Design a protein around this ligand. Structure first.
Ligand SMILES: [K+]
Ligand SMILES: [K+]
Ligand SMILES: [K+]
Ligand SMILES: [K+]
Ligand SMILES: [K+]
Ligand SMILES: [K+]
Ligand SMILES: [K+]
Ligand SMILES: [K+]
Ligand SMILES: [K+]
Ligand SMILES: [K+]
Ligand SMILES: [K+]
Ligand SMILES: [K+]
Ligand SMILES: [K+]
Ligand SMILES: [K+]
Ligand SMILES: [K+]
Ligand SMILES: [K+]
Ligand SMILES: [K+]
Ligand SMILES: [K+]
Ligand SMILES: [K+]
Ligand SMILES: [K+]
Ligand SMILES: [K+]
Ligand SMILES: [Mg+2]
Ligand SMILES: [Mg+2]
Ligand SMILES: [Mg+2]
Ligand SMILES: [Mg+2]
Ligand SMILES: [Mg+2]
Ligand SMILES: [Mg+2]
Ligand SMILES: [Mg+2]
Ligand SMILES: [Mg+2]
Ligand SMILES: [Mg+2]
Ligand SMILES: [Mg+2]
Ligand SMILES: [Mg+2]
Ligand SMILES: [Mg+2]
Ligand SMILES: [Mg+2]
Ligand SMILES: [Mg+2]
Ligand SMILES: [Mg+2]
Ligand SMILES: [Mg+2]
Ligand SMILES: [Mg+2]
Ligand SMILES: [Mg+2]
Ligand SMILES: [Mg+2]
Ligand SMILES: [Mg+2]
Ligand SMILES: [Mg+2]
Ligand SMILES: [Mg+2]
Ligand SMILES: [Mg+2]
Ligand SMILES: [Mg+2]
Ligand SMILES: [Mg+2]
Ligand SMILES: [Mg+2]
Ligand SMILES: [Mg+2]
Ligand SMILES: [Mg+2]
Ligand SMILES: [Mg+2]
Ligand SMILES: [Mg+2]
Ligand SMILES: [Mg+2]
Ligand SMILES: [Mg+2]
Ligand SMILES: [Mg+2]
Ligand SMILES: [Mg+2]
Ligand SMILES: [Mg+2]
Ligand SMILES: [Mg+2]
Ligand SMILES: [Mg+2]
Ligand SMILES: [Zn+2]
Lengths: 187, 159, 53, 105
RNA sequence: CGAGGGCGCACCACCGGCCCGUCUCGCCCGCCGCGCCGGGGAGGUGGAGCACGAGCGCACGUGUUAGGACCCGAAAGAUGG
RNA sequence: CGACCUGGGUAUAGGGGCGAAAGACUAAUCGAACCAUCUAGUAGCUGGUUCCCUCCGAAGUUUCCCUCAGGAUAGCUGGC
RNA sequence: CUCAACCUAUUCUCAAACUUUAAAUGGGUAAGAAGCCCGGCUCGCUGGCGUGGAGCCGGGCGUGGAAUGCGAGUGCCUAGUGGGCCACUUUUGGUAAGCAGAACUGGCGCUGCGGGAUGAACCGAACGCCGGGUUAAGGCGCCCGAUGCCGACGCUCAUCA
RNA sequence: AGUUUGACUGGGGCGGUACACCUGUCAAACGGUAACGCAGGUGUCCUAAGGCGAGCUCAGGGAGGACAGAAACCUCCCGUGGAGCAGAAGGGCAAAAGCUCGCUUGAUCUUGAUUUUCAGUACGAAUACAGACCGUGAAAGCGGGGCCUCACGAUCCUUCUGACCUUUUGGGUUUUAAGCAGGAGGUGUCAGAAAAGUUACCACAGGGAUAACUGGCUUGUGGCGGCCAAGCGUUCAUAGCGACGUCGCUUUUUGAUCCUUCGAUGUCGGCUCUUCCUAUCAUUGUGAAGCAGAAUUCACCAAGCGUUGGAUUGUUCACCCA
RNA sequence: GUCUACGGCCAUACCACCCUGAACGCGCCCGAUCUCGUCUGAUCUCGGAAGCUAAGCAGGGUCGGGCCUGGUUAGUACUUGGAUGGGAGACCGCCUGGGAAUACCGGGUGCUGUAGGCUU
């Protein structure tokens, strides 16, 4: 007998996409080969993002992509996102962008192309930059989800600002005892 | 079954040492406590204001806030299987500077200066402190004296 | 019993609901029947507008 | 306990210390038209008997004395409620105690 | 290959900033209604907030709950015969 | 030979009847008959709960509860 | 003259709720790059002062400032459980208990296997299906594997060994 | 008619509160740590016993002084606190925190942070700040209750106080009502139902988580022995006894416990019948004596054999007759 | 070599008794008009400078008490971890590490900071 613990032997991580999308599986095959047969760590990151779930591949708005592309030294670089690129109607000027995405919204696609931009899929990105040279790997806001407002410390604990689960919002719904000093306590 | 009183079981802990009662010496009030320095929480019983709780006596923390008479200390407390950093206000009577941090700062000043001097004259010197090494070989001289022969003594009944 | 975080739910199923349940399996048949009546009414008022006044 | 009938304490209306006139607070009379009383009377009417609990397990023997402070400044008659600790015997402006006096034989 | 240097995703810690409530202080501004009118500032603090959206619909799984509610089981209570 | 025994006909029906009184009797059922229904009544309690292999793997402790054969809560577990 | 009280210096014996003194085991912290050292700037706080303190901005320092071992950090959802029991040691009540109640670690519960004839908890050791070798604790007259050693030195006779 | 008739608990009931709190101890030198563990305490009290400042020194003892004495008052000396600080205890405290005076109301109005219990929820209590308005002192400062560790209470409802505040439903005025913020009226089963019994006429779901009867552990108590030998025995410790002590054994007493049994192990006594034990009443063989004989007593090997008939009582026991 | 004022550590500094003290100083001392307090100019407050180191104070002394620090007590008491060690138990021994406290016997009896004086 040996003195070890076996509760952490099996690392919990995606070794493949749980999706049955045959097109996603094809470009997983392409980037499984690229990650193995190159020393590019860019291919390793892209490959493991391809396995990720939809909640782990948040959409990237056009405004956020433009703002990251506008940073110094990123001219003539390809914006790579492993997910959906989304139109942001809050912006009025779209510059010229070279973009690779898993998926682009129709309105966002029209805006990028009309501004002289270029849109690539991940198969075309492999031919353009097999090692991912001259690319900016972007990601949508991972915690930009309603669930994360409810996560954290319990709402009925001091110094916790987490949203409780309520069927309705109003003066009659969970605004009394434990929420104000007049009604017992507040914390 | 035990009471939850704040000072239960502090009969001897907060009592003064023998023949050291009375007026608190004033050097304990003249000590300077900056932010980020390490202080030991004693908890003398002569001053009843700003006393630490019994679970912080003999604990060491880091000062994060300084007031007119007290300091704010971040001190680790273990509650069941979790250690969480408590923040407590303690009057300066119940704290004193920790010499563990003072000795290490002295060593850093020696280390940094010793490195500087070594570069100026050239050769390499040891900075890290090593654990007590095994004793080296040596000669023990008899000096013309035969070592005294010891013998266990017979037993006889004391009292 | 409550279990961890959740929404305080108040279902209105304390009133013997299973004896008053309205299924909609006749919805496709109802749409057909009204459409026959619409077509029959339009034929009856032959030149008059089908929708009415 | 004993408290004087007058004291100089803070007045929120004046924003400063002013002499105050100290009296004991009593609970006022029930309105009968308070919303809870109206709801209670509607609930009690008809059949069903007593519809709300009746305490009948008194344990306390004292009440927290509430002092009604009135600012004496005639422009400002603002009143405040001060609560002191529980006491069995409360007196308002009684005879002050002396020290070096013979206790009446 | 590469010492160094640069732009830095997401995310984390922290410091600022903005919106609503409420306190403290204080000085200005607006006019078809000069008012018991309207607006603005600084400093704390309360909010399930903002700070270049992530949601909606459908399906599946797990968990909790109301329903006969995993299955079988009272002593009883009521209505009408 | 009696407050005697007995047939038949009548009357009293369920929280009601009837009782020389035993809570007796009221269709083998009586300290509240029988039948159908509400009703698959409720049960923190007892009993049961149906194929295989692989991997991980506990707790009987904290706090609160008309709480002490039960829950909530933290802890310990697994999965992602 | 004697016996007392009292005082003084001694003397016998003690304390879970006494103590001058005071362990072992034990609890906290530190052993650097978030550090050190140079300059400078901001403040409505502080102020004899270019003060004090805090914050901010640049620059230079790597011998990475004990040993040993190990890859870490972080989030969501969550079942079962919430009758325990036993052993060494510490330990409370009790005459005591296979009694009742705590502390610490391990175990049984959830665990098979070798040994203790037998046995939840002892001793050894933890387990996929097998071959060879060797052991642990325990054993080697026979049951029953192994002393069928020319084993060593003594002790002991029991008519309940 | 409907309903209720707490909980803990070496079974339940009765008794207690170990049900909300506080001190010392248990507790094994951080902290935490249980038993209907030990010793106690709490539901109050205080316009001062709160807050400042000043000035003093306390308990006790010695020596003196009219009435005066063991204690009345005055004086000196010693006095580490051996006093006092409201109360239980512990800690703390001397030109203090104690005593006496003087002036006072910081026991006032506010927002957050933190500690304690802890889930790191609440209440309660507490600590350090910050913003007002004050008190005291010459001032530094100290004070937002009591030297510290306890002295206390949610939602709903009611009551009072505050904003020339909000709403009061088509608009306006005024009552009224509702609201916002802060106190109070209380839940002591103290995180907070509104609650009397009885059942042997009883019922159901369960429980060997839990009593009554056997068994098991234990052996205080009961019973039976041993060691020492101060004494008893005219005399003489030990023929026969055995005080003060002390070591055991037994499970035919009674307790202690609750491990097995609550989908059931038929619960006293007697009758009948068998067997077993020996700690032997008799009988066989013996040793001892305060054994002359007779009788009796102590002890050994020893359970082969026997140990009865009756009155009263259900009795086991008991007592008497023979 | 000392002192005064303010101190830090707070007896190696305290307590009892004895001896010495030059110069400044600190005191004792004289007085009560003013300031201020008293039953009392005793204390406190104020105004002084005849006298005195008697006292405080400083230094020294005592087979002094205390205190401080060593030795002994003693590798003893106690103790972490270990054993299919001993013993009926009570307890005890050993292995592996740590390790006290009285009595008894020695040594010591304030160091020092800032500012200002005296000491031929
Ligand atoms: K993980
Ligand atoms: K206790
Ligand atoms: K206690
Ligand atoms: K269900
Ligand atoms: K019927
Ligand atoms: K007849
Ligand atoms: K009936
Ligand atoms: K129970
Ligand atoms: K759980
Ligand atoms: K649970
Ligand atoms: K303890
Ligand atoms: K609190
Ligand atoms: K002041
Ligand atoms: K109110
Ligand atoms: K309760
Ligand atoms: K016995
Ligand atoms: K027995
Ligand atoms: K039993
Ligand atoms: K049974
Ligand atoms: K008989
Ligand atoms: K008989
Ligand atoms: Mg293995
Ligand atoms: Mg495993
Ligand atoms: Mg206080
Ligand atoms: Mg911020
Ligand atoms: Mg859930
Ligand atoms: Mg009913
Ligand atoms: Mg069913
Ligand atoms: Mg049924
Ligand atoms: Mg309750
Ligand atoms: Mg069960
Ligand atoms: Mg259970
Ligand atoms: Mg339990
Ligand atoms: Mg036990
Ligand atoms: Mg038990
Ligand atoms: Mg089990
Ligand atoms: Mg296990
Ligand atoms: Mg096993
Ligand atoms: Mg075996
Ligand atoms: Mg055996
Ligand atoms: Mg083998
Ligand atoms: Mg064998
Ligand atoms: Mg053989
Ligand atoms: Mg009970
Ligand atoms: Mg301990
Ligand atoms: Mg302890
Ligand atoms: Mg004073
Ligand atoms: Mg203030
Ligand atoms: Mg309670
Ligand atoms: Mg009857
Ligand atoms: Mg049992
Ligand atoms: Mg004799
Ligand atoms: Mg059975
Ligand atoms: Mg049977
Ligand atoms: Mg039978
Ligand atoms: Mg015999
Ligand atoms: Mg001496
Ligand atoms: Mg040893
Ligand atoms: Zn006023």
């Amino acid at each position: 007998g040996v003195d070890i613990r076996h509760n952490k032997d099996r690392k919990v991580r995606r070794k493949e996409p749980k999706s049955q999308d045959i097109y996603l599986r094809l470009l997983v095959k392409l980037y499984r080969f690229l990650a193995r047969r190159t020393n590019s760590t860019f291919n390793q990151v892209v490959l493991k993002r391809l396995f990720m779930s939809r909640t782990n591949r948040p959409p990237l708005s056009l405004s956020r992509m433009i703002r990251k592309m506008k940073l110094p030294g990123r001219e003539n670089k390809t914006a790579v996102v492993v997910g959906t690129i989304t139109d942001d109607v809050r912006v009025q000027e779209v510059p010229k962008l070279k973009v690779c995405a898993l998926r682009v919204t129709s309105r966002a696609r029209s805006r990028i192309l009309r501004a002289g931009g270029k849109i690539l899929t991940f198969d075309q990105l492999a031919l353009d930059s097999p090692k991912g040279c001259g690319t900016v790997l972007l990601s949508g806001p991972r915690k930009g989800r309603e669930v994360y407002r409810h996560f954290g410390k319990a709402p009925g604990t001091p110094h916790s600002h987490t949203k409780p689960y309520v069927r309705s919002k109003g003066r009659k719904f969970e605004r009394a005892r434990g929420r104000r000093a007049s009604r017992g306590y507040k914390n | 079954t035990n009471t939850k009183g704040k000072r239960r079981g502090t009969r001897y802990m907060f009592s003064r040492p023998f023949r050291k009662h009375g007026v608190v010496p004033l050097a304990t009030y003249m000590r300077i406590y900056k932010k980020g320095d390490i202080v030991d929480i004693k908890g003398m019983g002569t001053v009843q204001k700003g006393m630490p709780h019994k679970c912080y006596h003999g604990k060491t923390g880091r000062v994060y806030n300084v007031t007119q008479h007290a300091v704010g200390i971040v001190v680790n407390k273990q509650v069941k299987g979790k250690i969480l950093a408590k923040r407590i206000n303690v009057r300066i009577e119940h704290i004193k500077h920790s010499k563990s941090r003072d000795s290490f700062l002295k060593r850093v000043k020696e280390n940094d200066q010793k490195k500087k001097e070594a570069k100026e004259k050239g050769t390499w010197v040891q900075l890290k402190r090593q654990p007590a090494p095994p004793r080296e070989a040596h000669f023990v001289r008899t000096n013309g004296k035969e070592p005294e022969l010891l013998e266990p003594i017979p037993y006889e009944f004391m009292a | 019993a409550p279990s961890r975080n959740g929404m305080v739910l108040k279902p209105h199923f304390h009133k013997d609901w299973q004896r008053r349940v309205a299924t909609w399996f006749n919805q496709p048949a109802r749409k057909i029947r009204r459409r026959k009546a619409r077509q029959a009414k339009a034929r009856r008022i032959a030149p008059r507008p089908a929708s009415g006044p | 306990v004993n408290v004087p009938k007058t004291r100089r304490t803070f007045c929120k209306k004046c924003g400063k210390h002013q002499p105050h006139k100290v009296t004991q607070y009593k609970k006022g009379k029930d309105s009968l038209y308070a919303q809870g009383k109206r709801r209670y009377d509607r609930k009690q009417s008809g059949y069903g008997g007593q519809t709300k609990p009746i305490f009948r397990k008194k344990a306390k023997t004292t009440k927290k004395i509430v002092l009604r402070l009135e600012c004496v400044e005639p422009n400002c008659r603002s009143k405040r409620m001060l609560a002191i600790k529980r006491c069995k015997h409360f007196e308002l402006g009684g005879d002050k105690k002396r020290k070096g006096q013979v206790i009446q034989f």
